[PDB]
């Protein structure tokens, strides 16, 4: 019935989870230099005191 | 520099003043939650106490005590994960039609609903103002000779006609609060037909009683 | 030295009282869970007992140990007035607490509508006005300072009118006032426990009877603890301070039996937070937050 | 046919699992424990805090409480910009418009209430009322000043045109009520969490479910997108948090801890995405290393259950809202 149109997601192109892990860790490694939470920023540039 | 922040600070002071005033007004206002199916005597109680959304607010005052009333049956489904918003209420007005077991085993559903709501973790420290509305229809059905409450309370034969039958419905609702043994609150019905004027007076007396118990437990004279 | 076995005990008692009052006055201010009118009254009682423990208690110990009054020529009286002020304020705080409990229990509608913290502030003002009215008349002499001149000692004032006025205002009127208040809110509680049985199986009927009996026992135990503390601490001092001044012809009272009476009266400041604050469930759970 | 068509999806999902996230992120050593501490505290509200949202501008903040008050803070210097009177005191949701002009809230009143802060007379007044839902409103997010996507307890997500006030698009793919809803950074897709233990990726432009994720074992209470947009993180009552990827329909990482037996209330991501902060029932918020499941450290600081989490657009600060009527700002 309508579940047929709910289950039409069987045609999606699931790319390899290897590339998913790879570009996820690449995003984390590339953006770790601009994350104030990951490494505490100096109190000079911190707006919260 | 300083000029643009003094205005923000005084706006903060005014906002804090209004918030504190609103809390002070609210604290002198009572909290009550209603439960029970639509087949119960809920409509009569609400119609008396009034004089699309899942919450309807009926507010009033009796004997200089402000009441805020929340019927919550209009919330369609899944009471499980939003009932924590009502743990601060003083008491629950649980309305059950005592005459409605014949009219499916609806009274067993009322039993299980009462058992679920009394042993609720959020409402273990809250009283229950029970109701057993339209007792007159119960008397009419019992006097018919067939619609006795033993059909859906198969343990009636030991209890001690209309008064005898009505109190067993009262007492087996009390088993939920008594066998659990909360030790802080107690349950109490009030037989009402559709035209009794003492419902709001009974609720007011009950709220006064609950406040007295709270005071006697705070200073631990109870 | 003989002072050592006395100074050690007295200093330990004063330090324990200081800690007991300081914990309460800090825990009420730090936590907003305990910030209510009744606990505001209990906190005012705690700060009054702290004032007793840090102002008049250590010096009183200093006078007792040295046996002589040498800290000042005539400065004894000012201290006694402080002593009288703080002690009668601590006594009348119990009456204020009893009156607040009576008004809350008997009249719930008044509680809901008009039990503001302004009520606690007015009660504290009126409980310190009693000290202002009691400690001051002997400062200028009750009628005229003519007989209590003794540089070597520091004792309570014996003036003919004052030995009646002070002993009745500070203790006896509060004693019967608390008696009638905690009798009224005793029979009210007993009537309510009886109502919960009259208006309402073994696990049903016996449970009702046993919890009603337990509630009756529980309230009589609470009233017994409060009244026993008040009586056992203050009564001997305020019966000695009235019997003896009228029989100065044969005023004999052994020091080993009379000096203990002064300090039993004092120990009310230590024992007040033990029953009013420490044993209370709210503080019993709030003190867990500090570790 | 569709009752067994999920077999092909499951087979492809299992066969696509070639390299697990936990099997490859070992090229980076753990970042180490974080020393997060509270910088500001907020005490204006006087009842349980149920929701909170950060503006795109880093300055302001919004919080909704069950006392009938919606307030707008000032994070840098603790202050009140606006505190408005509500027409219903049963709100469990709030959202701040990216443009900085609108704020919305909703709850048990089955209604999305939208408040305009840029009134010509200055006073904040309600602008529109979105009452089409038949279940308690549980999540709300803004797309623009005339576009909004709403979650509710009627087992249906909705899309509302504020100008017309109509449910322009409806998402009926779920089988239970939905409580969490966050938009992708490219605001053309979004995901929703539900109590049927599933998360569904919604295609806004066609109004149809695209991918269904079935990792959690209980009711999902929180969901939020990875900053990239190709992934998102969830939070459920199973005392576990899970990370899902759109392009690879498996679960990349599962976050769990021995000292955790309580459900997750809110989740959010930092600017880089490596730090995932989740608020729990147990009074505190944990911080997780998203690539090795290492809990860097807890926040605590709340004497009642924390109900909402939010990381600033610049990622500088973390705000937490709890039922103790207190908001704490972390850094
Ligand atoms: C149970 C104890 C620890 C506290 C309660 C009892 C109090 C009132 C007792 C215990 C120790 C007692 C003191 C012990 C020693 C002396 C020296 C002597 O000149 C008698 C008075 C004096 C100064 C006593 C006064 C009363 C006293 C303080
Ligand atoms: C009205 C009243 C009077 C007295 C009291 C209790 N008062 C305790 C005393 F019995 C302690 C000793 N008394 C002193 O006056 C004193 C002597 C030496 C001192 F070093 C100090 Cl500090 C005080 C007399 C009062 N309640 C109410």
Residue numbers in the entry:
A (entry chain G): 14 to 62
B (entry chain A): 12 to 62, 204 to 255, 263 to 319, 333 to 394
C (entry chain R): 34 to 233, 325 to 415
D (entry chain B): 10 to 340
Q: What text does the study give?
A:
Of interest in this approach is the serotonin 5-HT1A receptor (5-HT1AR), which is a Gαi/o-coupled receptor belonging to the family of serotonin receptors that comprises in total 12 heterotrimeric GTP-binding protein (G protein)–coupled receptors (GPCRs) and one ion channel (5-HT3R). The 5-HT1AR is located pre- and postsynaptically in the brain and is a clinically relevant target for the treatment of neuropsychiatric disorders, being the main target of the approved anxiolytic buspirone and the antidepressant vilazodone. Cryo–electron microscopy structures of ST171 bound to 5-HT1AR in complex with the Gi protein compared to the canonical agonist befiradol bound to complexes of 5-HT1AR with Gi or Gs revealed that the ligands occupy different exo-sites. We observed several differences at the extracellular portions and in the binding poses of befiradol and ST171 in the 5-HT1AR-Gi complexes, which may explain their distinct signaling signatures. Both agonists show a bitopic binding mode occupying the conserved orthosteric pocket but addressing distinct allosteric sites of the 5-HT1AR.
In addition, we solved a structure of befiradol engaging the 5-HT1AR in complex with the Gs protein at a nominal resolution of 3.2 Å. The complex of befiradol with 5-HT1AR and the Gs protein revealed minor changes at the macromolecular and microswitch level, leading to similar orientations of the toggle switch residue W3586.48, the PIF and NPxxY motifs, and the break of the ionic lock. The densities for the 5-HT1AR-Gs complex suggest an extension of TM5 by one helical turn and a slight kink of TM6, even though cryo-EM data indicate variability at the intracellular ends of TM5 and TM6. Again, the methyl pyridinyl-substituted aminomethyl moiety of befiradol engages residues V1173.33, I1674.56, I18945.52, A2035.46, F3616.51, F3626.52, and A3656.55 in the orthosteric pocket through hydrophobic interactions. The distance of the charge-reinforced hydrogen bond between befiradol’s secondary amine and the Cγ of D1163.32 remained at 4.0 Å. At the extracellular side, the comparison of the befiradol-bound 5-HT1AR-Gi and 5-HT1AR-Gs complexes revealed a 1.8-Å outward movement of TM7, leading to a rearrangement of ECL3 and an increased distance between the carbonyl group of Q972.65 and the indole nitrogen of W3586.48. Substantial differences were observed in how befiradol’s 3-chloro-4-fluorobenzene group reaches the allosteric binding pocket in the complex of 5-HT1AR with the Gs protein. The carbonyl group shows a flipped orientation, now pointing toward TM3 instead of TM7, which requires a rotation of the side chain of I1133.29. These changes lead to a differently angled engagement of the 3-chloro-4-fluorobenzene moiety with the allosteric site formed by TM2, TM3, and ECL1.
